[PDB]
Amino acid sequence: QVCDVFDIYAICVCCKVESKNEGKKNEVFNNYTFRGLGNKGVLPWKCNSLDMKYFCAVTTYVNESKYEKLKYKRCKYLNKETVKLQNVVVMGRTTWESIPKKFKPLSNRINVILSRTLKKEDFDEDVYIINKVEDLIVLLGKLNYYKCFIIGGSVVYQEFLEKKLIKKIYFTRINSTYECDVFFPEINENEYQIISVSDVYTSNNTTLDFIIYKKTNNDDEEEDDFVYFNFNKEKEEKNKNSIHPNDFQIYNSLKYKYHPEYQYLNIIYDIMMNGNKQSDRTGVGVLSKFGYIMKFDLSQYFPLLTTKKLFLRGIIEELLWFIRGETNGNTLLNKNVRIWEANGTREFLDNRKLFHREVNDLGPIYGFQWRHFGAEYTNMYDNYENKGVDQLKNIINLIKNDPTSRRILLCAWNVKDLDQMALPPCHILCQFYVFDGKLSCIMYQRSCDLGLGVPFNIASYSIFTHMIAQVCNLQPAQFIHVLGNAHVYNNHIDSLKIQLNRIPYPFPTLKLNPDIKNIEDFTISDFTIQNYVHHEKISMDMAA
Amino acid sequence: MMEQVCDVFDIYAICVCCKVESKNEGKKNEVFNNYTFRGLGNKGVLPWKCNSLDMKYFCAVTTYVNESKYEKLKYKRCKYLNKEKKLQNVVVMGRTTWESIPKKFKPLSNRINVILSRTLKKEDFDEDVYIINKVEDLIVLLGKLNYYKCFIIGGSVVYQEFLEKKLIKKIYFTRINSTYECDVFFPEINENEYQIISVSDVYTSNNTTLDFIIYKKTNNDDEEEDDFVYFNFNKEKEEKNKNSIHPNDFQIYNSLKYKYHPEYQYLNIIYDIMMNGNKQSDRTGVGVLSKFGYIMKFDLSQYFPLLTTKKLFLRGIIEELLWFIRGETNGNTLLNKNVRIWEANGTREFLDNRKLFHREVNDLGPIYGFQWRHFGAEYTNMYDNYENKGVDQLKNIINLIKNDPTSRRILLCAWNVKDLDQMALPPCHILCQFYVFDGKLSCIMYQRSCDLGLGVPFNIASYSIFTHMIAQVCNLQPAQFIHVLGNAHVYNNHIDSLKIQLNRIPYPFPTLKLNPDIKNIEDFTISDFTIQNYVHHEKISMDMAA
Ligand SMILES: NC(=O)C1=CN([C@@H]2O[C@H](COP(=O)(O)OP(=O)(O)OC[C@H]3O[C@@H](n4cnc5c(N)ncnc54)[C@H](OP(=O)(O)O)[C@@H]3O)[C@@H](O)[C@H]2O)C=CC1
Ligand SMILES: NC(=O)C1=CN([C@@H]2O[C@H](COP(=O)(O)OP(=O)(O)OC[C@H]3O[C@@H](n4cnc5c(N)ncnc54)[C@H](OP(=O)(O)O)[C@@H]3O)[C@@H](O)[C@H]2O)C=CC1
Ligand SMILES: O=c1ccn([C@H]2C[C@H](O)[C@@H](COP(=O)(O)O)O2)c(=O)[nH]1
Ligand SMILES: O=c1ccn([C@H]2C[C@H](O)[C@@H](COP(=O)(O)O)O2)c(=O)[nH]1
């Protein structure tokens, strides 16, 4: 338990490994997916401004007031008193030798270098050199530092990991593939666990995030006022006994959960712990809550859930289908997009009292309201050109010609046509906001199937936001999701319980064909999802 | 380094005050301030009979102790006095107060009871209590006892003297938002000596709202911690309008430790917009600071969310609401009641600019009222009878709530894309969605455009009232009113007034009473509504142009 005494940590940054058998994509994913450390003396990627900023901020940050407990602990262990504190950076010759003279030594950091062929006289008096691994255990009990960061390379990391000389690991995850020759050791989840995950970012054309591994352990006035003000709160949660929190060992073991995906995950948890039991229109049971709001920064990442596998061909086609103004269910079925199949059958239509509606003729739904709101619906084959209000065209002109307008709204809930619809829309409306050349969008959803629908809904409107943004020569900003009746079907509980204990991966990114400048010109091949790392698919309905 | 007695011995005061039955009639405009709540007792007992919630609060505070903190407290008092079985708090009361406590509750449970008295001595008491005949003897006793905190619990004479001697570290003050007959009062609190540092959520108990505030005596694993500092390395960008808007102007707003009063959801949004809002031009040309996407939640079962940091009247908005329900679009109806909410939007000038050259003055077009009762019908003019024309959304939602409460399709939508250009102006309140659980009705309203300084305050009241109305005629109880804000903005000329407002501390919300006899949403009239116990700050003019 020495790595805990001298505060020895390891900070790194790994990308994804390429291949000669199969490059650019992987079948299965796990933490070991991120391991690329370097290539030909240098780093796999040119450089990463943000990670660089992170590295600096960590290896040069010290809390003088905390140096106390560490002193009152390091010496007592040493069995001897330690004879403007900084931190220490330990690296191998190769590592040091790769740093440019202009930047070496590393400012405000007590440099150290492992090597069996380097004179202590070939360098500074501030730059300490060692011949062995334990030779560092001493140098520490003799110096006055705050923390010790092992910054590589591969050789160094390996040795320290095996000898259990690492307290925690600050792992930067660069979500992109590069050529490599050296890699980071496979972290053993029995001797190291993740405790915190950060927000996701985009730097130098790649998303990345920061996670923290922790060696498995295996005024006060205001404080009291806080207790008084919570005197009327509830001891436990309603579904406490129904949903056992001990089933979320992973979810709770996390201290910092800044990864955007938790906005989705936290809501699942809030509904499971505090949701109300209700019986919906399907006899099936649900846990529901009312009113939530999620926000996703599309400029930093594409919010495609990573705690399970998601497909997008279908939802993109649906989006293209809406844009064309179609209401013909067959168009989608012939492309094997069966999102609306159950809603267009003879039985469903008849139960909806639409006895005179042809099978798969969904009536005046999304597409029809977006391009012909107000027009008289006849059948899915009629020509509606120039009939009704073309809201889509209108909001796009507004965005271009009057960005600050507060009436840029696309509404699908046409009260007059509701009963003619196979089913009323769940996505009531989209509202747009434009500022400093950036486009944001809010979408209000009246009914939210958290386990199955919402995941797609998020991807759906994020993609749409990008589309509207690109044809308006703007950059996407935020996709804002407002949930009204938010529910979790009971048959999704066990599945969500499993998903809740999975740690998100850095989000992927969405790439659109840059040449498409008309909302109506997009085709399926114009959409590409890049670097999508995810946990394996999950059957929400375990009942198979 | 002047060690203060109240700090060393942690002496606090906890009380509860109602409003006093003494209001002059000269000016029907009653002024309010903290001194509004001062009633302590009447004819030997409490002005109100009992208050379950405050009692629970009182009990929780005066019996709560933090074992792991005594250790440090003990050292503090020892060094002060030159000194080097379950832990309880001490409660101190005047003899009259002690005699007002029912026998089955004497002495106050799990608490070292101390009583001040000159007429009675220990021999006059059978209970396990300490008797003292002067203030200094309390300090002495405390110096000899093992206790967590010391609470002065009344009555008026006792509060009075302890406050005067500045022996109070903090005052846990409960505000009962109602009036009762009183003969004893809490002393007037001097603002230079005491400042409010925390206000609680608002609650309803025993037919009255109440909140809890705290006054403070005026001045004059470390691992997870560092990780946090790390995870905030890129928060480099502070606040864009912080330099434009000096947060030093929010001295009082920023001094409050705990801001749990529901009014702060609104107040916090104004603050967020002011510090981080985006500057933008407006269709009006005024210019605004704006953000996109907010949500506020108000518990209508616990209070009626009418802002107290400024004065508001609801006669107008109530008549507007009734006006909506009747499906009217005729502006004259409101103007004849001296409600000018829509006057500017129905002028010849305004209508012409909307390109509505063939629209009669004050004929607002197919707006809210028309959409709620006739969505889909072709608007003709405001005098037309649209009986059984279009979709009566209002009647529909009332039926879904009654016969299919779990429906996730209970929405009232005003945004009729087809009629938009025919309206004096498109609706700001896009839709209302209802949720029903355990005999309780909740309501979400989406506002596409929100003027925080002027409209929102009224909008919060309008829909909260509407929710009470729908719930009643549906035999349900009002639960939450959820307000979703799309484009939230603060007009540039409202800023100075909003700065003032943000530095005012909220009073407990009032309550709304509906004539319990009305069973149909259409049978309501202006005298079926009653706002009670509205305590508020001085009215403010958002636009100080003269
Ligand atoms: N992603 C990341 O965080 C990092 C990536 N890198 C990348 O990885 C590559 C360098 O890693 P790597 O090849 O492993 O080289 P190293 O930096 O790990 O240095 C290895 C050398 O250091 C000395 N050394 C290490 N451990 C000991 C020991 N226990 N006792 C005595 N001497 C020791 C020896 O040098 P000697 O010859 O003097 O005996 C040894 O040959 C580069 O391509 C670089 O770009 C480097 C650091 C961090
Ligand atoms: N709203 C609230 O939070 C509270 C309200 N109350 C209410 O207020 C009323 C009681 O208040 P009040 O009339 O002022 O009476 P008090 O409870 O304050 O008791 C006053 C009496 O206590 C003793 N006393 C006070 N100070 C001293 C001292 N320094 N030395 C010796 N004895 C002292 C003396 O009793 P003695 O005659 O024996 O000499 C004195 O007459 C009741 O109506 C009660 O219901 C009470 C507590 C809290
Ligand atoms: O894009 C969609 C489509 C449907 N649903 C869900 C919500 C409900 O669980 C069910 C529709 O039933 P109603 O809400 O209309 O009753 O489908 C979604 O979450 N997202
Ligand atoms: O009930 C209402 C009606 C209007 N407004 C405000 C919002 C805008 O500042 C202005 C209307 O402008 P547009 O959003 O329509 O452009 O009135 C409100 O806050 N609440």
Ligand SMILES: CCc1nc(N)nc(N)c1-c1ccc(Cl)cc1
């Ligand atoms: C800024 C890159 C960086 N980021 C992280 N998270 N860890 C590291 N160990 C390094 C690093 C790579 C090469 C040298 Cl030579 C020194 C430090």
Ligand SMILES: CCc1nc(N)nc(N)c1-c1ccc(Cl)cc1
């Ligand atoms: C429970 C009422 C209550 N609430 C608060 N907040 N403070 C108090 N001091 C009292 C109180 C009143 C009379 C007696 Cl006799 C004892 C305590």
